[PDB]
Design a protein around this ligand. Structure first.
Ligand code: MN
Ligand code: MN
Ligand code: MN
Ligand code: NI
Ligand code: NI
Ligand code: NI
Ligand code: NI
Ligand code: NI
Lengths: 374, 374, 374, 374, 373
């Protein structure tokens, strides 16, 4: 795994992860930092004469200040002409929709809330030893034009937009929006695999595998419909964290018949997260190369993700699920990801949007350092 | 314990709890589900012609939609004539009172907040393998007419109402309301045990065993006065989670003199929750058959139960206390239960009321699956 | 002055303002609407086949949906190269700073909160009869790189940035940020008036005219230092709304010595808003052509602007101050404006940022319809 | 009437209130300010060498900074020895109790919330022309030891403490706490009037004149029992603002039988606030020696006082009730006052506690400038 | 800390509970009785209908918890700061957020901590300590901070903290942003007579870069503190570093200066008892005086939502409280600061509650282990 390598001499009082991290930082380049500084001084003017740090412009035009600037995800460039998204390693897009919600709405603002709090972050992860600014190009293409009155029209919009981004070669990060969108995203991706199969790593307390809910393909039905697609095999759908009082019986039945794999929170913690991640990877990637990551923020215990429509006690703790994701994203390439169910109206201190931002950034960083992205 | 039995063939990549759960669901009946659907169409009219799912009425009458309907606890039937409560296996009642609180008030709304968020839940628990709708009859008899200006009059009201419900043969679930009510609930139950003894399983960070507080029998005093009752032995009062800066010295002294049993959070986690539950059960049931469960939401770490009047860091984590409760409620029958100190005005995303709802449902489900109820 | 003209025949049951408004709408062009629709489809792809309204792209690119898209002020174009701001009639810029606040901080997020809620608005005002999309070009140049640890360095940044925008010819709209910044904005503008004089229309409960506060030139001091500038005469500083318990005595004294004009809330409502506006305009523009509008959201009664660091009861009601602003902005050209003290952390449902947005838009609309802008 | 006097020359562009205010400030002394500065430097040490303002200590001791310091009401000295309260013109005391509430609790924190936000204020009112620091001595004696579980014991405590303060000669300002306490405060005052009679100016949407409520003397009953006291005549109870859906019929009946006077909000606004105040004063002071001011924050429209247990639409607007109170407190001496029903748990922006603080300071300032206090 | 057999107890108690129940039975009540007597004198005896004759008319001590003027745990306010040396412990606030690089609001940290601190009694069950009986605590209020000038604020904070530390009282500084750590350590170091000062720093952020937005903000305190001659960077132990907000220039400067860093995962995997041993060994190596700098952000965001720079993956409460207890039991501390609590982002006050708990547990362990009082 990731340990101190002896390339940069360091004293022995460091913890093991810290020692890896401090050395790793010393070996990272600064080229893209220098470019952003130079661009900011050109576009935002040199700072006033009383500013001692001559890297500081008059107008904010990069990372700093964190509390300033137009809110794109982690202050990535806004790509207005979406046909250019293939020029970037990673494309963030939003799917602001909550017509698939069976309890609270509000996740239509998921994309806005995630973008907003993502400004708090720098470009660099200490323990992962990655500086995204130096190692990958990220853009934000904004939001799908969703259709609140009609979930089927919304699916069509999301499949087309996500399919466009996936076909361009950029790694799509979809900010939801409720979990019904997982059907539309997977449907768009599967349309561009040339018949190859797509597995799914699904983090959620909810099984999301029933046919209809309140007479529509709501957030409780995405994987029933997705695994009806010929090149999306249900045997490669791995459902991580199922439990509680909101996994509906019709969804459990359909998943049994289709032979999805389920691992409860207790299953994963009792076996060890490292073992749980190995088992999930082996199933999801069995006989398939492309795997989609679908992360519902509700798989965390409610106290860590209060801003969601279907909160549940007894979920994962952050260090558990972040380790799980890091192992996944270090070990295998991913076709893309979506993070769904963040509902800012129920998230007063933005800690749910914060968690979602963290999940995205850890996944991207691990994809990068393990050679799967960039 | 609860493991896969081989009655329903299943592949080998399920986690152990998930494998048990998927099999268990396949063996559950659907009779009560079908009855509710049929009744809903009768009471709420057939749905409009454009509705494809003909199980859907015009007016919501039953579980769905979760965001709709009159808010009884888990949408159980309201039993206006409280003399009929004996017709049900379980009777939910509220005790909306906060005149016993020594810091923040607000738990007068505990019953309303618990009932409100209870709608989010289905009738079925995945990992416990139980569908309450199929296995037990539950009613909601509303609230005790509490007396905010007079804690003693409130006690008399609560003892009379709880005593009535307990004497009817229904399993009482009391929604608090502050912990002073634990005296009144136990006093009413003990009146109907034909002289038999009553033990108490008390989950809380606070001992609640002093004589008076601010000159009255407030939430720090219930078990001092409960264990003065001749058939309520203090040696069978087991206090789980005691710790922090709010266990008052006079309560500690009185509990010592009466020989109550205390296990701190750290005690329980270090020994192992399974071992802690075994020890608690042995002490509480030693020479008594009837045991009352008194659950203070404050026994959870503050972050999981922000909506309480006396929050404390360093409490249980949800998976710890839920396992504790599951073992208790699987191993022994309970005389009844109360869940106290939920204060919605300090609970923005309703995660405290959500925790309380989950505690009730897990306890009921374990009582049912283990043959103690329904 | 704005009444039905008889150019568009209308029935007689309309109210007078409605009759003006309905006729005015019928006379507005749609050219820029059509251009934005066409551009959106080009940049955002045609909508999916199931979408009937073929004006809808796959990706949101323009006004719709209001809940979608990157949050620039009223979804104006982000102008990354601030050297291009002179190409627009109006340039929005933020000054995210709260080192000048003497009670609550949080107005560093004022620009972000105003931009966010501004998406709720369309481009057209019913009762003012103005469609900004058709009549004026607006851009958003982002934020000044403020210096939270040093108010003087922040002033220097703000004066340089605002001076640049004002010098370019664009009408600057400065989103604050606390009222200390009033000094730095006026200082920047006055540097570019060719020695001509600058009056100030100041809406606030607070006089903001003392020398220092907590040893620095904080939000209680901006007009003391602004009127020390040779071409900023204190006799043309009109202070509208002063009152309550937070107008410090040293500020009252200095304003008296310098002969600023003050009208309290009660003065204005007692005389009539129309008369109050006449008096304020008469004084501010006496012997000067250029006047700066400095609007503190705290001049509204606290209930309308809870998200501010220095709230006060007894302020203006919205219809009173909006009428005041409309008369000002119809009657005379303005050199620019700033809206300060919006503090989103204290603004739960964003009604303070909503008020700020409304003030900007009414002022711009009145400048446009009266031939002072665009 | 308070008008410009021509004692301090001023230009003619000032509004009438502003002209009176600017002159009035120029005539106020600074003696007590200078004493506070000197005391602060002694007790808080001189500030660091880099501080230019040599009035600034190292430790905050006095008014500034407003965001700093121990929260007494408007940072008045805490008088720990309550036997010394007679040494002050005005004594603030809290009654933290909400056992008399018939809907929401939370007003037990009224005193704390009012004290907290009161730090925002200076010592001087612009439009009233009063500097409390220079003209009256104010102390804060903390809180009555209330008895949450027993409203009658709470009444006895409140009567004893308020009686003590009133008998000492200090003007009592009682921070509530629910309106049940109005009985206990008036009972304590009446005990020390030596047979002289007491009128009551009662601001509220609720009559608060029934016998019992939920079997106790709750906030709907204070004036039924107060006017049973021989020297508290019901004909001198003037009830200002009654209306809505929470004025109970038994209270209306009892007030009718006892011939209290009621003026609704619409009555007062339609007749004119100046005329309403004259009528209320006439009735309250008719044939009595002293009048008690009982102000329920609920008499304001809910939007201005969201933090209360019994909010109602259609109440007073701030400028209406502040004028009403100013006329009362300028025209007649008052025996004391209570401000009740502020409930901080429902007051997220603190604007309710702000309104309460403003009411107190306006009443005090008018008592002082009109020769009734100090 | 185990049951000692001094007070006979039955065998069904958990081990910590058994220690606790015995320990309470051995605590005195002298200072309790003095507080009761003082309250009746100063607040009057209660009304005749009150049966408990310890209850005054006016609240004047611990009770009721929801009542009274909010000093830290209702300790006496010491208006004359020249008298702070009469107390074992002196609480002071530093209400400043001009060092914050994202959210402000921590200027109210001191007010929010004082407010929620009223909920506590004077006694800890599992630590077996009654602070009212064993240590004298005062609250001297707040430093007069300077919101528009971070450097002037540092000078005020160094002068006030230095005064309190020089008086002999144990200073507890309520922040305020972590920029203030430079100023507090600077003030303490002036008064060590050349003696060296180590630092135990609980945080997700290294806080070791030179400037940030052109000033010495909350990301820079330890760069400038370890430039002080008697503040060795080798004795700066940084516990909890991780996430996406540990800036690269801070990591570089700490590497060059040879600070020690142990991530949350490092501590949890090695065991908190082992992590505390290692941290104490490094911090106290060749130094007697060690300062405790606790950023509330070292806890997972969900436990400390009221902060300007929250981060997932932090410590859980029982982990960090054990860590702190071992530190504060094993070694004396020169003082402590608790920083970054931002009440405007703390709706149910759970962040200020955590901060209060950290302070009380540290003080209680210092007392019971003979380092204070
Ligand atoms: Mn889910
Ligand atoms: Mn009322
Ligand atoms: Mn930190
Ligand atoms: Ni889901
Ligand atoms: Ni309890
Ligand atoms: Ni202002
Ligand atoms: Ni009332
Ligand atoms: Ni820090």
């Amino acid at each position: 795994k990731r340990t101190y390598q002896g390339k940069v001499p360091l004293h022995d009082n460091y913890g093991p992860e810290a020692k890896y991290a401090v050395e790793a930082e010393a070996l990272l380049p600064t080229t893209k930092f220098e470019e952003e500084i130079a661009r900011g001084l050109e576009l935002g003017l040199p700072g006033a004469d009383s500013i001692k740090d001559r890297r500081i412009p008059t107008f904010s035009r990069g990372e700093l200040p964190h509390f300033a600037g137009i809110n794109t995800f982690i202050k990535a460039p806004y790509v207005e002409d979406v046909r250019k998204c293939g020029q970037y390693d990673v494309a963030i897009l939003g799917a602001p929709f909550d017509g698939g919600t069976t309890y609270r709405a509000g996740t239509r603002f998921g994309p806005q809330g995630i973008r907003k709090i993502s400004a708090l972050y720098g470009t660099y992860s200490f323990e992962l030893g990655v500086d995204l600014r130096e190692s990958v190009s990220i853009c934000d293409v904004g939001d799908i034009f969703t259709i609140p009155g009609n979930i089927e029209k919304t699916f069509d919009q999301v499949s087309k937009g996500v399919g466009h981004v996936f076909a361009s070669g950029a790694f799509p990060v979809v900010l939801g929006g409720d979990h019904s969108l997982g059907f539309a995203t997977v449907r768009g991706v599967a349309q561009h695999l040339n018949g190859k199969k797509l597995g799914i790593l699904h983090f959620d307390r909810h099984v999301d595998t029933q046919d209809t809910d309140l007479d529509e393909r709501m957030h409780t039905t995405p994987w029933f419909h997705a695994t009806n697609i010929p090149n999306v095999p249900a045997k490669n759908l791995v459902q991580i964290g199922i439990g509680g009082w909101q996994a509906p019986r019709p969804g459990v039945k359909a998943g049994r018949e289709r032979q999805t794999t389920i691992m409860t929170v207790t299953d994963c913690v009792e076996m060890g997260i490292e073992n749980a991640a190995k088992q999930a990877l082996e199933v999801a990637f069995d006989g398939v190369d492309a795997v989609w990551l679908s992360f519902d923020v509700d798989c965390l215990d409610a106290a860590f993700v209060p801003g969601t429509g279907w909160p549940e006690p007894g979920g994962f703790l952050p260090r558990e699920v972040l380790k799980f994701l890091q192992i996944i994203a270090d070990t295998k390439p991913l076709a893309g990801m979506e993070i769904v169910e963040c509902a800012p109206p129920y998230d007063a201190a933005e800690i749910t949007s914060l968690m979602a931002t963290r999940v995205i950034c850890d996944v991207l960083a691990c994809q990068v350092r393990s050679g799967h992205l960039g």
